[PDB]
Design a protein around this ligand. Structure first.
Ligand code: HEC
Length: 104
């Protein structure tokens, strides 16, 4: 698993829901910035979901592993549309890149 490969994975992955590079339009859910640093989905000019506005919790690596169970159980009311990826190895791989992306 390489960082370069991970970046590409996220791109088809879903990136449309997390908007592209800063400059376009706000995405449906926090891309990643402040994922393991900020509270939960409390971005700036970004339109947070009902859950984010409530200030859920900081999505961590380990917490994400368990959260992978019932996405609706963590943030009820939010639906996840799209996702050309599923392979547990693919998802986990992207997370590694995310670890450095937030720290590295
Ligand atoms: C569109 C229908 C989406 C797809 C496909 C993916 N995400 Fe998303 N995500 C989306 C929305 C509208 C929201 C808000 C609340 C929710 O839980 O859906 C989210 C939420 C997240 C967050 C929140 C992070 C934060 O800063 O609070 C993250 C980090 C997130 N979703 C990650 C993620 C990943 C890794 C995806 C592909 C592997 C993915 N989402 C798909 C919108 C959509």
């Amino acid at each position: 698993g390489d960082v370069e490969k991970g970046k590409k994975i996220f791109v088809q992955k879903c990136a449309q829901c997390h908007t592209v590079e800063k400059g376009g339009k706000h995405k449906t859910g926090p891309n990643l910035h402040g994922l393991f640093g900020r509270k939960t989905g409390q971005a700036p000019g970004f339109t947070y979901t009902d859950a984010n506005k409530n200030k859920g919790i900081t999505w961590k690596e380990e917490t994400l592993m368990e959260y992978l169970e019932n996405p609706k159980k963590y943030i009820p009311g939010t639906k996840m549309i799209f996702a050309g990826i599923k392979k547990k190895t693919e998802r986990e791989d992207g997370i590694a890149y995310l670890k450095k992306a937030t720290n590295e």
